[PDB]
């Protein structure tokens with residue numbers, strides 16, 4: 039299934055994901071597409087920050103749901 | 115601005131709303147688009163049930179935020 | 191048999207339940223495991239809120255089905 | 265990557281860890297370095313006690329984050 | 341006598357307690373002042389987690405000693 | 415005593431601070447060294463954002479602790 | 491006089507500047523308002539990247555001209 | 567010989583490379599070490615972006631030279 | 643999308659244009675808004691004079707880019 | 719007297735000129751200093767392109783006035 | 793901040809410099825460290841020879857950038 | 869004989885030159901092949917800038933030697 043990530047730049051990127059994929063995987067898929075390191079990504083769906091731990095279905099992210107990307111920059 | 119209301123069943127409606135619109139209004143806009151009576155709608159954002167009283171901005175629902183729709187159905 | 195109750199926030203509890211258990215019982219078993227009063231629980235399956243009245247099998251909740259937990263008010 | 269674990273007593277251990285390492289692993293790495301049994305360790309990040317279950321990235325522990333060590337010992 | 345409980349979040353609460361009060365009592369007094377359920381509280385003094393069983397004087401917590409509050413969530 | 419602040423660039427500033435100094439003071443000492451206005455600084459220790467109100471010892475920042483400097487950048 | 495900077499986030503910030511102010515100054519004024527380190531800022535006007543060296547009038551930036559902010563992230 | 571690549575986070579990876587290795591190879595060696603897809607990597611030495619085509623010696627990258635890893639993020 | 647055309651005299655017109663519009667069209671849209679004959683207009687972007695032939699996207703003129711207007715005035 | 723010729727790109731040349739010098743002369747003095755052929759130069763003052771014909775004082779270009787240099791085609 | 797100046801001969805100097813230092817200053821700092829007269833130094837960054845006039849930040853020389861040293865000597 | 873000119877930008881041009889050709893000639897041959905005006909070229913061999921005056925053999929530039937091209941802009 040397909041989901042959408044809208045970034046801080048306003049850009050709307052599409053990802054092929056599986057409900058059993060983790061937030062970590064999605065972060066990783068985003069790096070693979072836009073270059074941002076996963077440690078610097080924060081994903082938001084329905085008014086929560088998502089945990090790298092959990093999966094898309096853990097949060098009820100279904101076919102064509104839209105996620106938000108925020109950036110955290112730290113000297114890591 | 116646009117928001118998304120997704121049911122747990124995976125159906126997703128898009129709504130044209132104003133930050134100053136109330137939960138009541140959104141419920142009403144949902145009925146106007148999918149037929150569900152507002153008394154049978156429960157809206158959820160950021161893990162909590164929204165009150166018909168308050169407004170979208172009261173809850174920090176912004177451009178392209180996603181809400182969750184849960185339904186009350188008698189004998190359903 | 192086992193079922194799963196997931197919150198929208200992504201937390202997931204497992205419960206040991208019987209098909210003949212009621213929604214009331216499941217609510218009660220959830221309180222027994224996570225502390226939430228049953229009056230504050232809303233259970234959701236197949237897109238709709240379940241009635242305390244009915245049973246799991248009344249709704250077709252089988253071995254390893256997933257329910258949703260939403261919270262009322264305080 | 266490196267992280268720091270500081271006790272409330274002011275002692276500080278440095279650990280070589282991976283974001284995918286679990287709290288269990290970190291506990292285990294601490295024993296390997298200072299002798300404390302993992303069942304006697306409580307790790308704290310961002311104000312709260314971490315679960316042995318979850319991983320460092322589950323909590324957003326990144327390169328050079330600082331964790332807190334508290335000790336649990338019966339009658340100690 | 342007065343003691344201080346400092347959370348890892350930087351907040352500092354003051355409590356009116358008696359040397360003969362138990363850790364359980366202090367937990368209970370903290371709930372009464374900040375809302376946190378005692379099952380979610382961990383008190384720390386002199387580097388170690390205190391037992392609900394024991395009392396303040398059992399640990400040598402005197403007038404104006406500082407305890408640490410950590411949170412444990414299920 | 416000395417503490418370290420890491421910026422978003424990965425650069426490390428060293429600060430001479432006193433445990434009784436406030437977050438406000440440290441922010442102010444950082445501006446004095448790297449130019450960033452205190453209102454724009456987000457200091458993070460052990461996974462939480464520090465409040466200008468509190469002091470270093472309020473947070474358990476000791477000799478040679480490392481603080482992080484964070485920027486959060488959010489969508490349109 | 492007033493100028494506008496539109497950022498990568500889509501945000502449009504207003505700056506009080508003098509024609510004799512340098513690009514460095516503007517960068518510095520932006521940090522003072524949004525937190526971004528000047529070394530990470532790239533300013534664009536009329537299809538050129540601006541040099542920290544030159545001034546607003548060097549480029550013909552007048553009252554109410556609009557500049558663009560791009561971000562360059564590097565391990566500096 | 568050894569070279570150093572610094573990321574946007576400020577983190578430093580070390581690479582065992584040969585002067586006759588191409589930028590493509592180095593990009594590939596970086597993916598193998600930090601996960602970033604080569605198409606998303608922008609390597610900078612001495613102020614210019616390196617082309618996948620050319621080799622390290624084509625650019626005068628010698629024993630212990632430092633390369634930079636850049637991300638450019640642009641407005642809507 | 644919107645673009646800005648600024649004269650050297652500091653006057654700034656805003657235009658509603660399409661990336662596929664030609665320089666000729668923009669000139670024509672400028673006449674329609676400020677009266678200047680297209681033969682008396684010289685458009686400049688990124689330091690070079692634009693050709694009536696080419697289009698906005700041919701030159702990479704995007705949403706909110708700024709063009710420069712220079713004028714030809716006989717005996718003026 | 720001195721005048722300044724600035725490109726839109728922010729580069730700025732200084733020229734020693736006389737009020738009675740023509741636009742042609744200034745173009746010619748610019749070539750002599752930066753290499754650009756006069757046929758490729760467009761000089762701009764007070765928002766308009768100057769004519770090779772006229773002089774600096776014809777346009778009111780005085781000590782330390784600033785002109786603009788734009789480039790034609792190649 | 794630190795920068796590196798490498799000669800084509802493979803010799804490498806490190807310099808402590810400030811972004812506001814001029815090319816003249818850097819030349820002067822090089823003489824102070826290796827003896828070469830500034831009139832005999834040519835500094836190169838991003839493929840081009842730097843002007844004594846401009847500053848490091850004018851060119852976007854940041855923390856740990858690498859410059860190139862060429863030598864100009866009559867009949868040498 | 870052939871020589872190589874490598875720019876700092878990583879590009880590598882090949883030139884057909886004669887040992888008796890001057891630095892001026894090589895500059896001129898580079899313009900003829902890549903467009904750069906000779907006044908903007910700096911040639912570097914063995915660590916130092918070459919003089920337009922001298923010849924390739926004056927510097928010991930032989931078959932397949934490599935020169936370096938840097939750019940100087942006014």
Ligand SMILES: [Mg+2]
Pocket residue numbers: 062090091283284319321322
């Ligand atoms: Mg994980």
Ligand SMILES: [Mg+2]
Pocket residue numbers: 062076077090283321322
């Ligand atoms: Mg992670």
Ligand SMILES: [Mg+2]
Pocket residue numbers: 268478479480
């Ligand atoms: Mg430390």
Ligand SMILES: [Mg+2]
Pocket residue numbers: 514542543811812847849850
């Ligand atoms: Mg400067």
Ligand SMILES: [Mg+2]
Pocket residue numbers: 630631632796
């Ligand atoms: Mg080096």
Ligand SMILES: [Mg+2]
Pocket residue numbers: 514528529542811849850
């Ligand atoms: Mg700068």
